[PDB]
Amino acid sequence: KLSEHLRYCDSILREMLSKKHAAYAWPFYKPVDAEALELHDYHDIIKHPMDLSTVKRKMDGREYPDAQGFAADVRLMFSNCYKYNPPDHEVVAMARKLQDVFEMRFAKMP
């Protein structure tokens, strides 16, 4: 069903999940486990959690109306990371390098 633009998005998503960016992309593979990491305030601070597996799920299930809907979730993921964690945290540095990859790919979408 996917439109040409939403195919390009699935291409970007496929790249963000590859071994090429694993060094800084792995904390975003699955939802943030507030249990395991013992983050008792994560869901009180992050109202709308988001990760790459969820984005893949919605992409496979064709839940995105357009490319803008895709980008919104991907940025929501990064926004939550910036919002919850201190500015000096390594996971923030990881998010920034991965977002560099995303924004660069997304901007060059035909």
Binding site: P27, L39, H40, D41, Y42, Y84, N85, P86, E90, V91
Partner: peptide
């Protein structure tokens, strides 16, 4: 205040 720890277990 809770801080997420990426360090392996």
């Amino acid at each position: 205040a809770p801080r997420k720890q990426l360090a392996t277990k």
